[PDB]
From a paper:
The four domains of Xyl include an N-terminal GH11 xylanase domain, two family 36-like carbohydrate-binding domains CBM36-1 and 2, and a C-terminal CE4 esterase domain. Instead, individual domains and domain combinations were investigated structurally and for possible interdomain interactions. Xyl exemplifies a “beads-on-a-string” protein where the individual domains are “beads” each connected by a linker (string), with each domain retaining its individual function- making the synthesis of novel super enzymes for rapid and efficient degradation of bio-waste to biofuels within reach.
Crystals were obtained using 10 mg/mL Xyl-GH11 in 50 mM Na acetate pH 4.8, 500 mM (NH4)2SO4 at 18°C. Diffraction data were collected on beamline ID29 (ESRF, Grenoble, France) and processed using XDS. The Xyl-GH11 domain crystallised in space group P1 diffracting X-rays to a resolution of 1.39 Å but yielding a low completeness of only 87.5 or 67.0% for the entire data set or the shell of highest resolution. Each Xyl-GH11 adopts a β-jelly-roll fold composed of 14 β-strands, one α-helix and mostly short loops of up to five residues. The substrate-binding cleft of Xyl-GH11 lies within the inner β-sheet cleft. The latter adopts “up” and “down” conformations as part of its catalytic cycle.
Residue numbers in the entry: 29 to 230
């Protein structure tokens, strides 16, 4: 219904959305609810997402179950990934549950372990980003990744279950800040239609 071509944040039907790129061509069609369609080309970095911020300072147990029931028509022509994306605070962690990717499988390096969630096996990774932009300014924070061992582009992502598995692997879970269904592109072109994105909370 509404198409965005330039960096913007906002809300639609209760969902926080963002289009961002540092340079290049981007189009994000806001299609209601959690749904959005995007196209990129000639970009360095871009992202497209719809999700929800939680507010306050509450743990995943306090919030209740967080899940995404999603479907994406996913056609990256180069580097890209399709994931649930979000942040915790106390401690500050940028987290990723990646179900598909383009030419490169993120994040690199070697996994801490593997977990089994929503019928799929996920490699688990932890990294540190030093003095990088974040939801709390330029600072140092951890990244948590679950990355599916084989690509898929529709199904349920039970975010809470990844949180619990990460905890069991020793990765500390603080208060949940936001979670969103997210398409990233890097030095590439592509399209991705998130035609279904039902976020459920509790």
């Amino acid at each position: 219904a509404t198409t965005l071509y330039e960096n913007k944040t906002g809300t639609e039907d209760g969902y926080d959305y963002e289009l961002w790129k540092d340079s290049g061509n981007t189009s994000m069609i806001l299609n209601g609810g959690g749904t959005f369609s995007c196209q990129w080309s000639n970009i360095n970095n871009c992202l497209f997402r719809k999700g929800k911020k939680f507010g306050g300072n509450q743990s995943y147990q306090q919030i209740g179950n967080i899940s995404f029931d999603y479907g994406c028509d996913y056609h990256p022509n180069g580097n890209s990934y399709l994931c649930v994306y979000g942040w915790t605070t106390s401690p500050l962690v940028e987290f990723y549950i990646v179900d598909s990717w383009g030419s490169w499988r993120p994040p690199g390096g070697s996994p801490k372990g593997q977990i089994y969630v929503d019928g799929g096996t996920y490699d688990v990774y932890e990294t540190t980003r030093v003095n990088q932009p974040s939801i709390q300014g330029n600072t140092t924070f951890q990244q948590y990744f679950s990355v599916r061992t084989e690509r898929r582009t529709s199904g349920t992502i039970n975010v809470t279950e990844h949180f619990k598995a990460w905890e069991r692997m020793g990765m500390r879970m603080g208060n949940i800040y936001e979670a969103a269904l997210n398409v990233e592109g890097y030095q590439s072109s592509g399209s991705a239609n998130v035609y279904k994105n039902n976020m459920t909370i509790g």
